[model samples]
Target: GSSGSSGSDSLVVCEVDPELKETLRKFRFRKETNNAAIIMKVDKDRQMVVLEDELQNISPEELKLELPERQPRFVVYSYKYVHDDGRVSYPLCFIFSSPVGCKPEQQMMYAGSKNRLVQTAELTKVFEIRTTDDLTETWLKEKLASGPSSG
Candidate 1:
């Protein structure tokens, strides 16, 4: 019980590193020509989330099969998708790759961080899943069906 604070401070949270946050923000605001993707993970300290990958070439199919199926990952993705009327737009999407069969500790760490992660990224339109499948254009396209839907 004594393992607590002594001053007017608050409980620590898994904060996003500045560079990492910048990465998210950059991905959020920047308009690009190619598919953009960034992947992040919590550090061993569990005190912060770090940038794991900021890919130059990211494909949904390539991303899906390679994502870690046991850990939580924050995926910053956007693409120029097609519409029924042959319309197209570059929409940025935020996906929290939270898989099933995770230990509660790992689950809680990511879940709680996920709560702040979005806020820090200034992203609230978050989608969640237990598996890595169905990350194709249609899945997200239908969800967005138009503009980002990802803001």
Candidate 2:
């Protein structure tokens, strides 16, 4: 467990759109207790985003429908837990995918956050979206697979 200040402005990495960034930031610092996994999805047809606090009931087929074919789509997911030392840790993962692939900036955002602790000691992960044929239930299983522990 560790305690530290937020990322420096210069090194802060935001992979999603401005609106999504703000939304996630708000969830990160909310007053209420938040120790659950959050899933964010973008809806092209509706031109809006949907957020789910749990994924136990969501299916890959259901999620794959929200994405626009041949276009870029980004999903933001996070989970928080408290260590035995009482330090709360929040980790976020950004997942984006496109048939044409993402732009350079988007690529850099994912590249930079993977295993790189920018400002805080919390863990961050990144991934590109995938095709239905290539998608699997284990996509997020490895990341959200653990709970808080003393070790």
Candidate 3:
């Protein structure tokens, strides 16, 4: 367990679109739902997560009654995310992040006394701070730096 530093240590979590998350979860878990969208590829050794596309409905003729494929909306690249720990995360009161950039538009934090939701880029004194082929390493890093909720 790598606890964040009390002084210079901070966690950053890049927000994933809620819809995207649900879609990806459905596909990975193979749940009984129509919302089957793929959004990420996980690379364990390198720690990379590549974003994929939303699932769309294909014509019966096109698919031959097969399932539709989830495409990647954007080119593959490193996604912005963070790693988190309850011990350090449970105490922080502030965060530092870029509001506008190639990064996603959702971010948040909690500092024991108060729970914070950051929808835009601002700055958090307590916090700072994703992906490639496989989402494991990248996801792990982000989760370690910041809680999943923060992303």
User: RMSD to native for every prediction?
Assistant: 7.3, 11.0, 16.7
Q: Which is superior by lDDT, 1 or 2?
A: 1
| lDDT digits (tens) for residues 16-40 of candidate 2 | 3345445556655655453333344
Q: Cα deviation in Å at residue 27, candidate 2? A: 3.0
Query: Which pairs of residues clash in candidate 2, taking residues 3 or more apart in a chain or in different chains?
Result: 96-129
- Mind giving the per-residue lDDT tens digits that candidate 3 earns over 34-53? 22222233222332233434
Whichever of 1 and 3 has more TM-score, that candidate is: 1
TM-score of each: 0.76, 0.40, 0.20
Q: Which scores greater on lDDT, model 1 or model 3?
A: 1
lDDT of 1 by residue, 11-40 (tens): 335888887888877777776678877778
TM-score sort, best first: 1, 2, 3
Off by over 4 Å in 1: 1-12, 82-87, 146-151
Candidate 3 accuracy as TM-score = 0.20
Over 4 Å off in model 2, which ranges?
1-20, 30-61, 79-91, 100-123, 132-135, 143-151
Q: Which stretches in model 3 have alpha-carbon errors above 4 Å?
A: 1-7, 31-51, 54-151
lDDT value, candidate 1, whole model:
0.71
